[PDB]
Design a protein around this motif. Sequence first.
Motif, mmCIF file in Angstrom:
data_model
loop_
_atom_site.group_PDB
_atom_site.id
_atom_site.type_symbol
_atom_site.label_atom_id
_atom_site.label_comp_id
_atom_site.label_asym_id
_atom_site.label_seq_id
_atom_site.Cartn_x
_atom_site.Cartn_y
_atom_site.Cartn_z
ATOM 1 N N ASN A 167 53.181 45.673 40.249
ATOM 2 C CA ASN A 167 53.061 46.860 39.418
ATOM 3 C C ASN A 167 52.889 46.565 37.932
ATOM 4 O OD1 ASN A 167 55.727 45.961 39.253
ATOM 5 N ND2 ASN A 167 56.309 47.962 38.459
ATOM 6 N N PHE A 168 53.199 45.356 37.467
ATOM 7 C CA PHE A 168 52.745 44.988 36.131
ATOM 8 C C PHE A 168 51.231 44.987 36.074
ATOM 9 C CE2 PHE A 168 56.680 42.583 34.415
ATOM 10 C CZ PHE A 168 57.201 43.798 33.986
ATOM 11 N N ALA A 169 50.586 44.463 37.130
ATOM 12 C CA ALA A 169 49.127 44.466 37.218
ATOM 13 C C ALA A 169 48.573 45.882 37.310
ATOM 14 C CB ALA A 169 48.659 43.633 38.413
ATOM 15 N N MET A 170 49.217 46.752 38.099
ATOM 16 C CA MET A 170 48.740 48.126 38.220
ATOM 17 C C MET A 170 48.747 48.835 36.867
ATOM 18 S SD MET A 170 49.215 47.125 41.665
ATOM 19 C CE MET A 170 49.974 47.520 43.254
ATOM 20 N N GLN B 276 46.128 50.782 32.035
ATOM 21 C CA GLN B 276 45.885 50.804 30.595
ATOM 22 C C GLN B 276 44.401 50.609 30.296
ATOM 23 O OE1 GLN B 276 48.748 47.803 29.188
ATOM 24 N NE2 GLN B 276 50.433 49.247 29.610
ATOM 25 N N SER B 277 43.776 49.618 30.940
ATOM 26 C CA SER B 277 42.482 49.137 30.476
ATOM 27 C C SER B 277 41.348 50.052 30.931
ATOM 28 C CB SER B 277 42.244 47.692 30.935
ATOM 29 O OG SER B 277 41.443 47.013 29.970
ATOM 30 N N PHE B 278 41.672 51.259 31.374
ATOM 31 C CA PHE B 278 40.640 52.249 31.630
ATOM 32 C C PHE B 278 40.904 53.638 31.050
ATOM 33 C CE2 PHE B 278 42.421 55.400 34.135
ATOM 34 C CZ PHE B 278 43.364 54.832 34.904
ATOM 35 N N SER B 279 42.141 53.993 30.658
ATOM 36 C CA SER B 279 42.392 55.385 30.280
ATOM 37 C C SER B 279 41.344 55.809 29.268
ATOM 38 C CB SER B 279 43.811 55.613 29.713
ATOM 39 O OG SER B 279 44.231 56.987 29.795
ATOM 40 N N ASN B 280 40.843 57.025 29.437
ATOM 41 C CA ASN B 280 39.640 57.433 28.742
ATOM 42 C C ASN B 280 39.650 58.968 28.666
ATOM 43 O OD1 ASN B 280 36.439 57.931 28.612
ATOM 44 N ND2 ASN B 280 36.924 55.879 27.816
ATOM 45 N N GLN B 281 38.452 59.520 28.390
ATOM 46 C CA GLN B 281 38.193 60.950 28.308
ATOM 47 C C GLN B 281 37.546 61.479 29.580
ATOM 48 O OE1 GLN B 281 40.135 61.138 26.094
ATOM 49 N NE2 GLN B 281 39.616 59.083 25.335
ATOM 50 N N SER B 282 37.794 60.823 30.704
ATOM 51 C CA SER B 282 37.354 61.258 32.011
ATOM 52 C C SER B 282 38.535 61.129 32.955
ATOM 53 C CB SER B 282 36.167 60.420 32.511
ATOM 54 O OG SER B 282 36.364 59.045 32.206
ATOM 55 N N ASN B 283 38.379 61.664 34.155
ATOM 56 C CA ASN B 283 39.385 61.451 35.171
ATOM 57 C C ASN B 283 39.249 60.051 35.757
ATOM 58 O OD1 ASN B 283 40.340 64.024 34.780
ATOM 59 N ND2 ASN B 283 39.011 64.910 36.363
ATOM 60 N N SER B 284 40.229 59.685 36.567
ATOM 61 C CA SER B 284 40.274 58.354 37.131
ATOM 62 C C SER B 284 41.073 58.388 38.422
ATOM 63 C CB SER B 284 40.913 57.360 36.160
ATOM 64 O OG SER B 284 42.332 57.404 36.260
ATOM 65 N N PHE B 285 40.748 57.454 39.308
ATOM 66 C CA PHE B 285 41.465 57.295 40.563
ATOM 67 C C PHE B 285 41.012 55.993 41.207
ATOM 68 C CE2 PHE B 285 41.561 57.878 45.221
ATOM 69 C CZ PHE B 285 42.943 57.908 45.394
ATOM 70 N N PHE B 286 41.965 55.122 41.518
ATOM 71 C CA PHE B 286 41.624 53.811 42.051
ATOM 72 C C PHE B 286 42.840 53.229 42.752
ATOM 73 C CE2 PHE B 286 43.828 51.040 39.003
ATOM 74 C CZ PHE B 286 44.152 51.994 38.062
ATOM 75 N N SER B 287 42.600 52.116 43.432
ATOM 76 C CA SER B 287 43.587 51.493 44.301
ATOM 77 C C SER B 287 43.976 50.138 43.720
ATOM 78 C CB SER B 287 42.985 51.322 45.703
ATOM 79 O OG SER B 287 43.985 51.010 46.663
ATOM 80 N N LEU C 154 37.444 41.193 33.507
ATOM 81 C CA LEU C 154 37.199 40.296 32.382
ATOM 82 C C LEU C 154 38.053 40.686 31.176
ATOM 83 C CD1 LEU C 154 33.340 39.839 32.783
ATOM 84 C CD2 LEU C 154 35.150 38.123 33.224
ATOM 85 N N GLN C 155 38.130 41.986 30.877
ATOM 86 C CA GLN C 155 38.976 42.484 29.795
ATOM 87 C C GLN C 155 40.427 42.023 29.913
ATOM 88 O OE1 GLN C 155 38.657 46.781 29.670
ATOM 89 N NE2 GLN C 155 36.446 46.755 29.212
ATOM 90 N N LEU C 156 40.840 41.519 31.071
ATOM 91 C CA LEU C 156 42.174 40.970 31.253
ATOM 92 C C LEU C 156 42.189 39.451 31.281
ATOM 93 C CD1 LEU C 156 43.671 43.370 33.919
ATOM 94 C CD2 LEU C 156 43.465 43.649 31.425
ATOM 95 N N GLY C 157 41.052 38.807 31.018
ATOM 96 C CA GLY C 157 40.960 37.357 31.024
ATOM 97 C C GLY C 157 40.911 36.704 32.393
ATOM 98 N N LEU C 158 39.707 36.471 32.927
ATOM 99 C CA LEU C 158 39.527 35.849 34.235
ATOM 100 C C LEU C 158 38.325 34.899 34.211
ATOM 101 C CD1 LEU C 158 41.574 36.569 36.587
ATOM 102 C CD2 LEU C 158 41.379 38.521 35.077
ATOM 103 N N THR C 159 38.332 33.929 35.128
ATOM 104 C CA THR C 159 37.261 32.936 35.233
ATOM 105 C C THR C 159 36.410 33.244 36.467
ATOM 106 O OG1 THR C 159 36.819 30.576 35.682
ATOM 107 C CG2 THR C 159 39.021 31.372 36.193
ATOM 108 N N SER C 160 35.518 34.226 36.311
ATOM 109 C CA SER C 160 34.448 34.450 37.275
ATOM 110 C C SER C 160 33.341 33.429 37.047
ATOM 111 C CB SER C 160 33.876 35.870 37.158
ATOM 112 O OG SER C 160 34.899 36.860 37.125
ATOM 113 N N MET C 161 33.691 32.128 37.014
ATOM 114 C CA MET C 161 32.707 31.042 37.079
ATOM 115 C C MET C 161 33.275 29.618 37.208
ATOM 116 S SD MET C 161 30.706 28.351 35.861
ATOM 117 C CE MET C 161 29.380 27.897 36.939
ATOM 118 N N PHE C 162 34.384 29.365 37.924
ATOM 119 C CA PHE C 162 34.728 27.943 37.953
ATOM 120 C C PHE C 162 35.213 27.250 39.236
ATOM 121 C CE2 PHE C 162 33.961 28.159 33.423
ATOM 122 C CZ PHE C 162 33.244 26.985 33.319
ATOM 123 N N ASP C 163 36.223 27.680 40.005
ATOM 124 C CA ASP C 163 36.717 26.728 41.021
ATOM 125 C C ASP C 163 37.218 27.357 42.322
ATOM 126 O OD1 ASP C 163 37.751 24.580 42.454
ATOM 127 O OD2 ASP C 163 39.267 24.037 40.985
#
Length: 319
Positions: free
Chosen positions: A7-10, A15-26, A254-263
Amino acid sequence: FDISMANFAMELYRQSFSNQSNSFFSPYSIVLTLAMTYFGSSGRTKQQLKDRLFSVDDQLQAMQLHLANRLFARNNLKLLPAYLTRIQKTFKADVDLVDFSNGAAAAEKINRWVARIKNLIPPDVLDEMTCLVLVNAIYFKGNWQTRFAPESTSKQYFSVDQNTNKLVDMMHVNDTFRHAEHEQFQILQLPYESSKLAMYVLLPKEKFGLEKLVNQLSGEQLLDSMEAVTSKKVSITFPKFKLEETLPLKKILLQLGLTSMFDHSRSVIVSDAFHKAFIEVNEEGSVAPPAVFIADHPFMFLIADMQTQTILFMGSYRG
């Protein structure tokens, strides 16, 4: 504990999406699909993850609920059998091989498997030299444990903005629910009829305080808030609504720092991650003054498995 990392990840995705639109995700669907990549990672990639995963797991597999969570690998990748076997022995959908050179057929092959039948998720013009692809697709329509009286659904002011009013269909009910007041928000629990699941609703005390709430609240606080609610009479006003939302999952990751290119485990990256979620909310289900819960300004909501901590879905409602 792993419960507290989930739930820290959730909250970070939240956080990294709240905006001026609705939202819903898993966030649970994203985890499972990051777990698939994680079982065949090594080196820095494996350490970047696992900074949000620990040991080896504890699943947790427990009204309309359809999760489509799969990893698609390019057909010419000699996957090691050990990886393939533990993937198979841990998740529902094992790894599917796909020829991405036929961009249309590959995209349509995946879209088919997704269709639990409310999606069409990877569009045209995206699969070329792609390697690994993560897919999450969600539909949820739960029956409440306490029904909403459908003839008390009336339309009401919804404060979208300092300058925007909307009229939305508000459900109404007065009955016993678990609720708590805090300084910045009230929290209400709305159980689903096979009572494994519940919706939790976080209504800011300030009309437009939603984003400030979202940025002050920790996974830790969020869990304790869900646990620390007591049964009482609540006069509830709550919107009827449907949300379909496609989450920009790679960009957010990516906005949370990830390596989508290494191992992984030669040599292979995650090229794309798709996430589309559908929720439907309607009325269907079964002396001390009542607590009043009027969800007529932007609020936060989540669906959680109460027996396992697990936050299945989250979102915000703007009107």
